[PDB]
Design an enzyme around this catalytic site. Structure first.
Site, PDB file in Angstrom:
ATOM      1  N   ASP A   1     -10.849   3.796  21.886  1.00 44.41           N
ATOM      2  CA  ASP A   1     -12.130   3.971  22.620  1.00 44.41           C
ATOM      3  C   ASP A   1     -13.147   2.928  22.146  1.00 44.41           C
ATOM      4  O   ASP A   1     -14.194   2.792  22.806  1.00 44.41           O
ATOM      5  CB  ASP A   1     -12.672   5.389  22.438  1.00 44.41           C
ATOM      6  CG  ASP A   1     -11.673   6.468  22.815  1.00 44.41           C
ATOM      7  OD1 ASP A   1     -10.603   6.113  23.345  1.00 44.41           O
ATOM      8  OD2 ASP A   1     -11.972   7.654  22.570  1.00 44.41           O
TER       9      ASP A   1
ATOM     10  N   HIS B   1      -9.039   7.238  13.618  1.00 47.46           N
ATOM     11  CA  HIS B   1      -8.036   8.090  14.314  1.00 47.46           C
ATOM     12  C   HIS B   1      -7.238   8.883  13.274  1.00 47.46           C
ATOM     13  O   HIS B   1      -7.030   8.351  12.166  1.00 47.46           O
ATOM     14  CB  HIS B   1      -7.134   7.232  15.208  1.00 47.46           C
ATOM     15  CG  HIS B   1      -6.146   8.021  16.000  1.00 47.46           C
ATOM     16  ND1 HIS B   1      -4.885   8.315  15.522  1.00 47.46           N
ATOM     17  CD2 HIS B   1      -6.225   8.575  17.228  1.00 47.46           C
ATOM     18  CE1 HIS B   1      -4.229   9.018  16.422  1.00 47.46           C
ATOM     19  NE2 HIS B   1      -5.031   9.192  17.478  1.00 47.46           N
TER      20      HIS B   1
END
Lengths: 324, 311
Positions: free
Chosen positions: A272, A224
């Site tokens: 995710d 991320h």
């Protein structure tokens, strides 16, 4: 590492003693809602779950192959026509809040409607005595789920409710910058989320492996931009998956992938990473994984949409491209 | 600084010697196209003009009160459910360009369909031979327009074709950063423009029954827009061969092209509700143009800002 940046409350604490409805209010209003306020909010949300027959009609008109996210974006844009209005300020009702609660409320029912319609079957209507999470599982499975599963879904909704300034919210902000309808801005956010770089939760469901991660190495995109460390949501989802499985091949494979942290010193598991596993373990089809994410992010999007009170910003950037 | 900057070709150079088709290709490819390329692109456009029956049936179920822009956004997103795929780079075809031409070709036809269906009348299907601009007036008016209006319309299209990084264009870029179906990205662009701040020519074209006076009081190019001057000339030309006059009077002050965007459309017979939509039919090219270069060197747009709240 602005972890737990939820209206000045730690996500882990909110993970308990909080609901998507309560968390949604906290983000929209800015402070923990009073019992009366929360009760009124939930009831209004419940009486907004209703879906116009026109929407279901167009859904049947479109093909089953259609991806849920595309249908969701199209439906939200269509919803604006039924409840139109420009906040140019004239004003008929409280466009802000009133439209937002109607949207957040219909989001889940709309997703379930497409699922059944695309499968060639009539939609499962939501219940005014059922919460967003309760309706989700109830409508998808056609039967009300056990409290634990509903609670797990609620935690997921809270986790995906808001996250700093993601591309989806950013697009919503630019859309709101033009003083456009909330339905239109939500439509834009849905498409921005649809992208795999933003909503590749299903893209991480393609494990295509069996505890052979080391061979499967560089030279689904774990990492991320802001999470220079493992996403807290990912850890929460991981324990949730452990509890559900306790009560699995992908889980073992994904855990092995995270175990190979030696390869990644900067990037680390994203939300995710385990989101799809929990959804699949809950029976949700892969096609809708990202769609559920949109249901939760809707709250954050509208919260930022409300934060656009200082809409003096038209969000027009500066040209730097070489105009040869 | 950004005045008349289409791929390094001054908009005035495109004003003539150029058509939205060439201008669109010029913007997309970056260099004026060859006869073959232009013809092929034109034929491909004239080929995707057709609209799926599903879209019209959907539009029919929708209500007349619907605003053209809202329907346009809905339609673009819906079309994405017919031509599908994701660019992992497996693709069933050349997604880019193929989808690009499809979106641009179906933009105007969709707008016209809404106008007629909104009025409860069957739509006017487009003609392969006619150009986008020519088809546009044909579909709305219901008959072949004079080459004059057609030429003027094509010109207006080039003016609103590309405008640096307008909110709608930037929104298309932010979505593209997520590698999302072109249809979804363009639909979002359609949302942004829908905002009166981004597009409000219809709002401006109308005045508060001003008594031909200057009592109005107070409560990004700072000088008159170049496209505005172009429309100003066309405005005088059209009236040469009333409502515009008052605008020429306000030209005394003019700053934005929109200042005259609606009047011209009005004379062409375009309803006010479709003014912002017509703009979209044009800015489509630019949005898709930027999307292509973005996907070439694309990085998800993830900005950050401070916010008070503590814990």
């Amino acid at each position: 590492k602005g972890i737990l940046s939820y209206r000045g409350y730690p996500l882990e604490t909110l993970a308990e003693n909080s609901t998507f409805e309560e968390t949604t209010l906290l983000l929209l209003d800015g402070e923990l809602p009073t019992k009366k306020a929360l009760n009124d909010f939930s009831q209004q949300l419940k009486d907004n779950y209703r879906i116009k027959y026109h929407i279901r009609q167009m859904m049947r008109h479109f093909p089953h192959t259609g991806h849920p996210m595309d249908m969701l974006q199209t439906a939200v844009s269509s919803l604006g026509m039924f409840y139109p209005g420009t906040e140019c300020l004239c004003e008929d009702l409280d466009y802000v809040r009133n439209m937002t609660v109607n949207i957040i409320a219909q989001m889940a029912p709309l997703v379930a409607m497409w699922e059944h319609i695309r499968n060639g079957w009539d939609p499962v209507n939501p219940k005014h005595d059922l919460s967003v999470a309760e309706n989700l599982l109830y409508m998808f499975n056609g039967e009300e789920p056990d409290p634990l599963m509903a609670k797990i879904m609620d935690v997921c909704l809270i986790l995906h409710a808001e996250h700093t300034l993601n591309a989806s919210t950013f697009a919503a902000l630019v859309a709101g910058s033009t003083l456009a309808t909330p339905y239109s801005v939500i439509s834009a956010a849905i498409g921005t989320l649809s992208g795999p770089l933003h909503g590749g939760a299903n893209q991480r469901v393609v494990g295509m492996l069996q505890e052979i991660g080391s061979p499967k190495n560089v030279e689904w995109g774990m990492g991320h931009r802001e999470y220079k460390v493992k996403d807290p949501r990912a850890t929460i989802l991981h324990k949730l998956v452990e509890q559900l499985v306790a009560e699995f091949d992908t889980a073992l494979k994904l855990e092995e992938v995270c175990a190979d942290r030696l390869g990644h010193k900067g990037v680390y598991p994203n939300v995710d990473f385990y989101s799809g596993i929990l959804y699949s373990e809950m029976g949700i089809p892969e096609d809708e994984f990202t769609a559920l994410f949109a249901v939760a992010r809707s709250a954050g999007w509208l919260a930022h949409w409300r934060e656009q009170i200082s809409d003096n910003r038209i969000y027009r950037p500066t040209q730097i491209y070489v105009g040869s």
